[PDB]
């Protein structure tokens, strides 16, 4: 009851009892042919964009508020998919995201894993503006805080308002999955391309945001490990660019 999956020259292993969320019922696909027939011809890499990219693990401790990543540009240094971001003026893609934990039966805790489109964030100063570095750091995660933040140009990252001004118990409206250390330790989310235009430039726009948020904190006792590792793996799907010839 273990499946082994190979994309390109990558191989990972999952359990065949996985559960998969397809975001709004829609699988990813190519914009078919004839939105812009004449002088808008696209191309597709399909070479080493369809392959598993694995980020660094994060460390879940007793007081961890949460983590977030921006897509794309979490992959702007990831081999070929990142090269294509510099060579081409427009693009699009869907994604498959796997999130996994490594824990024992003597640990306990609960995580929400959610993919949020257009996650526009607020500044720590009400009459201020957010910086580009405070929104993302690429393949390194940003951190939520457990109290309200200060300083100039920083996202106001108190975890109960999720940086967007809503109640964090209501983020289940988005494509999401629960990880309860008692019953499962994995989550797969398949995201299609969602925009109000068919293609776009991939450097000054963040299509979506992946967030991981503990709702019940990690607990252990006498001589268990004091942390739990979380691992994120991403495979781009049906990527497509403007033709160069």
């Amino acid at each position: 009851r273990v499946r082994s999956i190979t994309l390109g020259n990558s191989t990972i292993t999952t359990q065949e009892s996985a559960n998969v969320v397809v975001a709004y019922g829609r699988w990813p696909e190519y914009l078919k042919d004839n939105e812009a027939t004449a002088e808008d011809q696209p191309t597709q890499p399909d070479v080493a964009t369809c392959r598993f990219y694995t980020l660094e693990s994060v460390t879940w401790e007793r007081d961890s508020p949460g983590w977030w990543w921006k897509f794309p540009d979490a992959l702007k240094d990831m081999g070929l998919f990142g090269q294509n971001m510099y060579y081409h003026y427009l693009g699009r893609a869907g994604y498959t995201i796997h999130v996994q934990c490594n824990a024992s039966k003597f640990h306990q805790g609960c995580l929400m894993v959610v993919c949020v489109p257009e996650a526009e964030m607020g500044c720590s100063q009400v009459d201020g503006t957010v910086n580009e570095h405070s929104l993302s750091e690429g393949e390194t995660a940003k951190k939520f805080a457990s109290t309200s933040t200060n300083g100039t140009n920083t996202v106001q990252s108190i975890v109960t308002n999720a940086g967007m001004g809503v109640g964090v118990g209501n983020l289940t409206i988005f494509p999401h999955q629960w990880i309860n250390l008692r019953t499962n330790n994995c989550a797969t989310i398949v995201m299609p391309y969602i925009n109000n235009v068919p293609m776009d430039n991939m450097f000054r726009h963040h299509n979506f945001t992946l967030m991981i948020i503990p709702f019940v904190p990690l607990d252990y006792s006498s001589d268990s490990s004091t942390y739990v590792p979380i691992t994120v793996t991403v495979a781009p799907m049906c990527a497509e660019y403007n033709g160069l010839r």
């Binding site: 526009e120 964030m121 607020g122 009400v126 001004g165 109640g167 068919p198 726009h205």
Partner: protein
């Protein structure tokens, strides 16, 4: 049936009220202007933020009232007043005086109306080179965070249509706005914090809800 999208959003509201004179010594008080967006009406803003992408037509009605200034001169006998209401599409010339050439450009649609009649009304289609409007944008304008140029919807300008050396008068216009044939995509959670300004999502941290006495407390039954 009352929770359909059309019955929830397609409702009229006053979104701008402005004043303008026939004679003045400021020359910006001689006309009134408004930029069309749905972010300075706090009740419509919140209902619109439940979705990420929207598509609609606009309908605008104008209620216009005049007054003679309390300055001094009485015994007048005046004909009814005429007004001009000009819509500028995105990518159009903007007037800066009431005597400007742009009040006569053939591609700015315009309405001429005289008091005493029914209130004037124009209908604007979905105007965007994109496929939908967006209530949320996680990007840069090219650089302002959260602002994309596909959301431009145009402007409205109002003036008096007198001749030379007119008599002093003060008018007020109220604009009533209504979206029609509406379609929405990607639902979102409702805004929990108060709005702080009209262009950002900035906020001060807010409590999740209000307290009670204890986790067991249920009020005595009647």
């Amino acid at each position: 049936s009352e929770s359909s999208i059309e019955n929830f959003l397609c409702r009229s509201a006053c979104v701008y009220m402005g004043e303008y004179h026939t004679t003045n010594t400021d020359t910006s008080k001689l006309f009134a202007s408004w930029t069309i967006n749905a972010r300075r009406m706090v009740q419509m803003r919140r209902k619109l933020e439940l979705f990420t992408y929207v598509r609609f037509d606009m309908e605008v009605t104008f209620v216009i009232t005049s007054k003679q200034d309390q300055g001094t001169q009485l015994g007048q006998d005046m004909p009814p007043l005429t007004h001009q209401i000009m819509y500028i599409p995105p990518g159009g010339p903007i007037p800066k005086s009431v005597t400007d050439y742009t009040w006569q450009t053939s591609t700015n649609p315009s309405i001429f109306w005289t008091e005493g009649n029914a209130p004037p009304r124009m209908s604007i289609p979905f105007i965007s080179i994109g496929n939908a409007y967006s209530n949320f944008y996680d990007g840069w304008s090219h650089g302002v965070y959260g602002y994309n140029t596909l959301n431009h919807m145009g402007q409205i300008y109002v003036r008096h249509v007198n001749g030379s050396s007119p008599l002093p008068m003060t008018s007020t216009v109220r604009m009533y706005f209504k979206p029609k044939h509406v379609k929405v995509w990607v639902p979102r959670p409702p805004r929990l914090c108060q709005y702080k300004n009209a262009s950002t999502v900035n906020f001060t941290p807010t409590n999740i809800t209000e307290k009670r006495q204890s986790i067991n407390y249920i009020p005595e039954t009647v």
